[PDB]
Design a protein around this ligand. Structure first.
Ligand code: MG
Ligand code: MG
Ligand code: MG
Ligand code: MG
Ligand code: MG
Ligand code: MG
Ligand code: MG
Ligand code: MG
Ligand code: MG
Ligand code: MG
Ligand code: MG
Ligand code: MG
Length: 180
RNA sequence: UUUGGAGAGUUUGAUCCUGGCUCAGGACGAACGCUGGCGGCGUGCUUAACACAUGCAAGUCGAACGGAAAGGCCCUUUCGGGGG
């Protein structure tokens, strides 16, 4: 099961000797719900073809973002493209709060508690570029410890240690429920 | 070791940036238009620190003192009232 959300259908026109030629380009994000993000932006001659190309591009370009429980690990300064976006993991039930493209990508990724705030040049394409860059700029505590040659207890705080333990127990319970 | 960030529209043939304007919310000691049933609970001259008809919004102590205008009492009465 995958998710596709229409974010921005746009009209473009090109000029040659006879006059103006109109055109379409669209952007769409695809995700599985466990932390897999896929974006695709393409041009076409009409909405259905545009969406088809967008879905193809999204499938081709994927990414995996390790999540903790049901929220991001630490706050992310998403600097790229032309906009500036900042993110902050949240407590549960609060939800994932951001602007349009931010919410598109995040709900595609499957998160349910996060805070974001676009900080200039909100054009949807650049915003999504920045979100993807920030999301790939995340760090996994286990790999951080592995790189630093330091162990999990000493590297990671007890709070997120217990959070990860509870998430693991919940995942085991869900797997048992599914198998049974 | 715990609480908590929304953008959208508008330049161009078409984008991107910057930048300007406008809107989606809460709040009023608020006023006007329409509507209108009760009860509960607060609130109520922000401008003219403008002049202000009337009355209310500062009184208590004879066991501090002299006295008795009006009343209570008794001696009196011509019923004017006279003593304490
Ligand atoms: Mg910088
Ligand atoms: Mg560059
Ligand atoms: Mg900007
Ligand atoms: Mg903007
Ligand atoms: Mg709070
Ligand atoms: Mg315009
Ligand atoms: Mg312009
Ligand atoms: Mg134009
Ligand atoms: Mg009325
Ligand atoms: Mg009432
Ligand atoms: Mg009242
Ligand atoms: Mg006195």
């Amino acid at each position: 099961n995958y998710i596709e959300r229409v974010v921005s259908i746009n009209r473009v026109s090109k000029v040659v000797k006879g006059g103006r030629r109109f055109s379409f380009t669209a952007l769409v994000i695809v995700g599985d719900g466990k932390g897999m993000v896929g974006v695709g932006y393409g041009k076409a001659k009409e909405v259905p073809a545009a969406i088809a190309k967008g879905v193809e591009e999204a499938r081709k370009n994927f990414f995996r973002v390790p999540l903790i429980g049901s929220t991001i690990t630490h706050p992310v300064q998403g600097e790229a493209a032309a906009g500036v976006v900042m993110l902050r993991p949240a407590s549960p039930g609060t939800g994932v709060i951001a602007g349009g493209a931010a919410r598109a990508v995040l709900e595609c990724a499957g998160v349910h508690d996060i805070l974001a705030k676009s900080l200039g040049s909100d054009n949807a394409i650049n915003v999504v570029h920045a979100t993807v860059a920030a999301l790939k700029l995340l760090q996994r505590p286990e790999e951080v410890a592995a790189r630093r040659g330091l162990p999990i207890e000493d590297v990671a705080p007890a709070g997120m240690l217990k959070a990860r333990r509870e998430s693991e127990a919940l995942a085991a319970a869900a797997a048992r429920e599914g198998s049974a």
